[PDB]
Every structure is written in structure tokens, then in C-alpha cells.
Structure 1
Amino acid sequence: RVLDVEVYSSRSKVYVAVDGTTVLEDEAREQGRGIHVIVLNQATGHVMAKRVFDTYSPHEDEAMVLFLNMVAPGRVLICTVKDEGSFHLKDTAKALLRSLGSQAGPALGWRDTWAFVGRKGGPVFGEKHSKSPALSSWGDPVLLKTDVPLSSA
């Protein structure tokens, strides 16, 4: 059928809920910065992997690329930003996000918020993005609600 997916991105908090159950939550004050990634099985919605890449810091984007490249094309892929995910989100990682169909990922900027749900090998199911209005500010919280189709048989 479908999965009811909720993805929240903000300065101080991320969460992901699937069918009304929270599968990822991070509101720890000075922890969990960067891009949180959840991978779901495309038939059951079970969580196959959960990661966080602190892409405000060097080398985390490289780890993110190596991880995403191992994710199977049929998987549901969910990304959400806590605090800052762009400073060291460099060209190879942005090109990979573009190849998934993400519009905001390849454009991600300083303290922007971003929530994404898509099938790894395409298409994107939902995406939201808020641009930070000033270097001293963060993007607005975004809460993406998306009905994700499930595979069967």
C-alpha cells in the first residue's frame, strides 16, 4: 500500500516518523549536527540503516557518498538536516544527491533546513527546503509529510 512518512528538519531538532511511529529523533543540544539518513525496506517500511554525517565538518561528505553508493536502488531514502549540513557538502556529494533527483540537496547552503524522501533509484516522493536568511540565522523548520508507495509480491 503506502507508508505515511514525516520528516522534520530544523536548527535544533530532527525526527522521522513512519506510519505514526518515530524512528529517528535527535534534539540533543550540541550533538547530531549534519545530515541524518534513514533507509527503509521498500515493501515493509522497516528501518534498514540509520546514519548521521556531520557535513559541517571535513570528510563526512565522503563517508556519506560511500554509504549511499552501497544502498540498493529500490530502497526508500530519507534525509534531514540538523543545524548545518552544507559547509563541507562538496561537489561529489552534491552531484550524487542531484542524481537521486533531489532539487534542494545539490543547492544546500549555510544553515538551510532540508527534508527529503525518495526511492534511491528514483523518483523523489517529497522534498522541502528553507533557505537561511542571514549568516547569523537558520532556515525555518520544515515538516515534510509524504505518502510513499510500497512495493509488493
Structure 2
Amino acid sequence: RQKCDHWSPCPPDTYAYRLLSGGGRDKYAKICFEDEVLIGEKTGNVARGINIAVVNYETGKVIATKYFDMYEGDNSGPMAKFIQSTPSKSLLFMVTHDDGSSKLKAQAKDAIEALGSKEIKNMKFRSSWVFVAAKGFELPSEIEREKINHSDQSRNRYAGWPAEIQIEGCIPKGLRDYKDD
């Protein structure tokens, strides 16, 4: 058994992550980091909307976990502010549960796209979405960092919702190390 129940073991000096979007209304989104559930049913901190876990890249410390309902309220503005306020050398993990698109506004999409999102622009009602971002450094090109799955009547795993999606990988811890010569 590997950290985050990974298919294969992570190489040494790497962070293990596993992101899971919600699957309809009964299967909840989950964010696993280094074998610890940051957001999920288990920690009682997952809800409808975009669920964000923020980790200090330098220390591996969880700095913030917060969800933003995109179906009720006006949480697009607060979400954009929350993202922009994250410190440099941070990892951001974003997963949808149920819906993350209904009231998703341009300012929030611009904040997520500025982090490297190629799919937030394509968000539609009830689309499942998972995303890994680095603030103040570049993630290695080979890790799976993003996935989207749109609601489609002919493919929907649940009556009214698309299938849940997952991403997993290993992030090297030494991308910003102060090296010798």
C-alpha cells in the first residue's frame, strides 16, 4: 500500500498527491496529500463548489482548506481573492464537488488560468474538474495536473451528473532548492 493508495511508489524526495472530483451527489470530492486527506468526507470539510487545499511547498505544511459554492451566493469574487492571497512557493489543489460552474465568474477564471489552468475556461454546469497549481515555480511537465469531464446525457455516470475524475502524481521537493557550485 502506497501513500494516497498510488498505483506505483513515488520516487524519493517527492510529494504524493491524489485529486478526486465528486461523482454526482453521493460520491464526494477528495484531496489526498502525502497520505493525508486535506479535503473530503473523512475530514468533514468537502461541499458543493470548488474545494481548494493550499500547501506550503517549502515545508509541506497545509496552510488553508476552503470550499466556494458556485450554485448559491456570490463566491466567485471571494475565491479569486483567496487564490491571489496565497503566498509564493505554494501548491494549490482544486477539485469540484457536484457543481463548480453555475455562478463561476471571469475574475475567478482569470485567477485559475493565471496559475496554468487550460480547462477552467471550458467549465460548464456540473462539469467535474481537478487541478494542481504551483505559485512561484513551475511544475514538471510530465505529472498529471489537470482533467475536466463535461455533463453529457449519453455518457453521464449519474442521472444529471458526469463521472468523477482523478489525477495522481509525485512533485519533486527540490525545485527551488538553494544549490551549491
In the alignment, the residues of structure 1 paired with residue 21 and residue 84 of structure 2 have an alpha-carbon distance, to the nearest angstrom, of 23
In the alignment, the residues of structure 2 paired with residue 78 and residue 69 of structure 1 have an alpha-carbon distance, to the nearest angstrom, of 14
Equivalent position to 1:147, from 153, 170, 180: 170
In the alignment, what sits opposite 2:146? 127
In the alignment, the residues of structure 2 paired with residue 40 and residue 62 of structure 1 have an alpha-carbon distance, to the nearest angstrom, of 21
1:75 aligns with 2:90: yes
Structure 1 window deviating more from structure 2 (127-136 vs 83-92): it is 127-136
Alpha-carbon shift at residue 45 of structure 1 (Å): 2.0
Paired residues of 2:131 and 2:147 also in contact (CA < 8 A): yes
In the alignment, what sits opposite 1:25? 40
In the alignment, the residues of structure 1 paired with residue 110 and residue 14 of structure 2 have an alpha-carbon distance, to the nearest angstrom, of 29
Paired residues of 2:58 and 2:89 also in contact (CA < 8 A): no
In the alignment, the residues of structure 1 paired with residue 170 and residue 119 of structure 2 have an alpha-carbon distance, to the nearest angstrom, of 19
SS in 2 for 1:119: strand
Structure 1: which amino acid aligns with 2:16? Answer: D
TM norm structure 2: 0.75
In the alignment, the residues of structure 2 paired with residue 91 and residue 53 of structure 1 have an alpha-carbon distance, to the nearest angstrom, of 15
Alpha-carbon shift at residue 84 of structure 1 (Å): 0.4
In the alignment, the residues of structure 2 paired with residue 94 and residue 128 of structure 1 have an alpha-carbon distance, to the nearest angstrom, of 15
1:78-89 to structure 2, matched below 5 A, reads: 78-89=93-104
In the alignment, what sits opposite 2:15? 3
Alpha-carbon shift at residue 85 of structure 1 (Å): 0.6
Structure 1: which amino acid aligns with 2:20? Answer: Y
5+ residue gaps, structure 1, are none
In the alignment, the residues of structure 1 paired with residue 151 and residue 137 of structure 2 have an alpha-carbon distance, to the nearest angstrom, of 28
Structure 2: which amino acid aligns with 1:142? Answer: I
Greater radius of gyration (CA): 2
SS in 2 for 1:141: coil
Alpha-carbon shift at residue 122 of structure 1 (Å): 5.1
In the alignment, the residues of structure 2 paired with residue 112 and residue 45 of structure 1 have an alpha-carbon distance, to the nearest angstrom, of 30
Assess, with a 3 A threshold, how the Cα gap between structure 1 residues 22 and 69 changes in structure 2: closer, same or farther.
same
Runs (4+) off by over 4 Å: none
SS in 2 for 1:117: strand
Paired residues of 1:117 and 1:146 also in contact (CA < 8 A): no
In the alignment, the residues of structure 1 paired with residue 137 and residue 58 of structure 2 have an alpha-carbon distance, to the nearest angstrom, of 16
Greater strand proportion = 1
Paired residues of 1:54 and 1:60 also in contact (CA < 8 A): yes
RMSD of Structure 2 on Structure 1 (CA): 2.2
TM norm structure 1: 0.88
What is the count of residue pairs matched by the alignment? 151
